[PDB]
C-alpha cells in the first residue's frame, strides 16, 4: 500500500520506531517546520481516543498534532525521543529508586488529571509510558487512549431516581461498588511501580503452580526478598497500598501523592526544572 | 406551542389517551387512510429506541409507523385500543387466573424474542404492556424501548483476550456474573405476574417496617395467604422461580415458557386464534 495523499502532503515518512498489536509507530518529518514527529498507525475506539486527546492538556499526557482517517488510521503526535518505559525495565533491568520515584510521580500527576477530568485510561502499562529523552532524568508522557472510558451520568443514577417496585436486586446490590471503575488505573500503576522498583512482575506464571488469575484475585504478589532488600521500606509500602484487592480500599492517586515516598523535595525540584526546560514560552506581561 | 408542520401534513391530532413522566400519548388520524394511530410525545435515548423499534418484528411488540424529531419527539405507533395493563390491575383489581396466563404467555414470547435478538428491555411494568382491545381475551404488545440495552461484544471480552499482567482483580471477579444483564427483565416479569395474579405488589412500603430495598435484595415478597388462596399452586410456583435473587439461578424466559403453568393447550389455542384474527394477509400461492 501507500501512505494517504493528505498525510504525504504535510509529512515525509521515515523509519519504524516501535510497534504494537494494532500497528506501528513511525518517525516522520513535518514539512512546514522540518521537525520530527511520531506517527502511530492503527490498522483498520479511535474516534473517541482522538476526541479525548484533543481535549486534554497536561505536561505528562501526549498531545495529538494531526489525524488522518484513511485505509488505516494515522495519529500524528509529538516524538518522545526516549521511547517506551518498557525498554528500561525489560530483561530484569532496573532503574534507580530515585528514577522510579521521578517517573512514578509524573504517572500519578497524569492519572490524577485524567480522573479529575472523568477519564479512565484502562491500559496503563510500560509500553504506554513514553520518555522525553535518553537521559535518566526526563519527562514522561502517558499515551494510548484506545480503550479509555469517559465518565458521565450513568444508567444506574437514572434508575435510582424512581421507585424500585420492578427493579431487580442485583441492580440495588451494584450500588455499593458503583463509581470506582477509576480504581483499575491505580491497580495498574501499582503493577508498573512494582516492576520499575524490582525489575520483575508481581503476578506471573513463571516458576509457580498458582494460576495468574488466582495470584491477582488473592492479591498475593511474588515477593523475592533478595531483589527487594535494596529498595526502601517506603517504596514497598506504597506498592502495597496500590495492590489492594478491594477497589474501595485501594489507594487513589491523591492518596498515593500524599504518601511518604513521594514527599521528596529534591525529586519535585527536578520535575519542575525539567518542565520549564521543555517549554518555549513567548513573552509575558510584567 | 404547535405540532410540527411535517406531522400535521400527514396526521390530524385528537384527544390525549394517556401520559407518562416524559410526555403523553395522543389519538391521531392518518390522513391517507382515515385510520386511528397513537402518537407518543416525548418532551425534549430516543434515537436508539427508534432504531430498535424499526428492526424488531414480533406480534407482541409494538411497531413504529413514523417518527418526527422537532421541538419534541413524536413517535407514531399502532393504536392499542385496550390501553395499558396498568388500568386493569390498579386499585387491587384482579384478572382471572386464565387471563393472567394468556397475557403472561405473550409477555414471555415478547421478552424471549427480545433476548434472542440481543435486546434487554429494562423498563417492564404494567404501563408498558398494551392491550389490543377492551375484550379480556386479547393480544398484548410491549412498548417503551427508551432505556433498552443492545448486547454485543463487551469490553470485558476484549480484556480477556490478553494476559492479565496489569489487570485489576475486580475485573476478573466480574467474569463470574457477566452476561446476565437480561435477567433483570425476568425479575420485572415476575413482579408483573405477581401483581396480575394477586392485585397487589410483592415489594412495597405499605404497612411494613422493612425498607423497600431490603425486601427486594432479600427476595422476601409480601405474601398475604387470603389473597392467594384462590390462585393455583402452579402459578405461584412460577412467580417464585422468577423472583429469585441470584440472577444466574433466576428463571430465563425459556424456562418460564416450559413451566407447568404455561402448558395449557386451551390458552395457546386462544392466542393463535387472536393472532390470525388480527392479520390482513393478502393472497398466498397454493
Ligand atoms: C524514540 C523512539 N524510538 N527510537 C528507536 N526505535 N530508535 O531505534 C520511540 C519508540 C517508540 C515510541 N512509541 C510511541 O510513540 N508509542 C505510542 C503508542 C501508542 C500511541 C497511541 C496514541 N495509540 N493509540 C492506540 N489506539 N493504540 O492502539 C501513540 C504512541 C516513541 C518513540
Ligand atoms: C385506547 C387508550 N386510551 N383510551 C382512553 N384513554 N380512553 O379514554 C390508550 C391509552 C394508553 C395508551 N398508551 C400507549 O400507547 N403507551 C405508550 C407508552 C410508551 C410508548 C413509547 C414508545 N415510549 N417511549 C419512550 N421513550 N417513553 O419514554 C408508546 C406508547 C394507548 C391507548
Ligand atoms: Mg492499548
Ligand atoms: Mg420507560
Swiss-Prot record, chains A, B:
Q: Which residues carry this modification: Phosphothreonine?
A: 159, 163
Single GO MF descriptor: protein kinase binding
How the protein is affected by changing residue 42 to F?
A: In prostate cancer; uncertain significance
Q: Which residues bind ATP?
A: 18-25, 40, 78-84, 127-128, 144
Question: What keyword terms does UniProt attach to this protein?
Answer: Apoptosis, ATP-binding, Cell cycle, Cell division, Disease variant, DNA damage, DNA repair, Host-virus interaction, Kinase, Li-Fraumeni syndrome, Magnesium, Metal-binding, Mitosis, Nucleotide-binding, Nucleus, Phosphoprotein, Serine/threonine-protein kinase, Transcription, Transcription regulation, Transferase, Tumor suppressor, Ubl conjugation
Q: In which tissues is it expressed?
A: High expression is found in testis, spleen, colon and peripheral blood leukocytes. Low expression is found in other tissues.
Quote the annotated effect of residue 232 to A.
Answer: Increased ubiquitination and degradation by the proteasome
Query: What are the leading ranks of the lineage?
Result: Eukaryota, Metazoa, Chordata, Craniata, Vertebrata
Shown residues in whole-protein numbering: 210 to 510 of 543
State the organism named in the record: Homo sapiens (Human)
Disease named in the record = Tumor predisposition syndrome 4: A disorder characterized by an increased risk for developing various types of benign and/or malignant neoplasms that arise at an accelerated rate and in different organs. Prostate cancer: A malignancy originating in tissues of the prostate. Most prostate cancers are adenocarcinomas that develop in the acini of the prostatic ducts. Other rare histopathologic types of prostate cancer that occur in approximately 5% of patients include small cell carcinoma, mucinous carcinoma, prostatic ductal carcinoma, transitional cell carcinoma, squamous cell carcinoma, basal cell carcinoma, adenoid cystic carcinoma (basaloid), signet-ring cell carcinoma and neuroendocrine carcinoma.
Domain of life of the native organism: Eukaryota
| Phenotype upon changing residue 94 to H | In prostate cancer; uncertain significance; somatic mutation
Q: Please give the name of this protein.
A: Serine/threonine-protein kinase Chk2
Q: Where is the Protein kinase domain?
A: 11-262
**Record PTM Phosphoserine, positions in chain:** 155, 232
The free-text function statement in the UniProt record for this protein reads: Serine/threonine-protein kinase which is required for checkpoint-mediated cell cycle arrest, activation of DNA repair and apoptosis in response to the presence of DNA double-strand breaks. May also negatively regulate cell cycle progression during unperturbed cell cycles. Following activation, phosphorylates numerous effectors preferentially at the consensus sequence [L-X-R-X-X-S/T]. Regulates cell cycle checkpoint arrest through phosphorylation of CDC25A, CDC25B and CDC25C, inhibiting their activity. (Microbial infection) Phosphorylates herpes simplex virus 1/HHV-1 protein ICP0 and thus activates its SUMO-targeted ubiquitin ligase activity.
Q: How is it modified after translation?
A: Phosphorylated. Autophosphorylates at Thr-159 and Thr-163 in the T-loop/activation segment upon dimerization to become fully active and phosphorylate its substrates like for instance CDC25C. DNA damage-induced autophosphorylation at Ser-155 induces CUL1-mediated ubiquitination and regulates the pro-apoptotic function. Phosphorylation at Ser-232 also regulates ubiquitination. Phosphorylated by PLK4. Ubiquitinated. CUL1-mediated ubiquitination regulates the pro-apoptotic function. Ubiquitination may also regulate protein stability. Ubiquitinated by RNF8 via 'Lys-48'-linked ubiquitination.
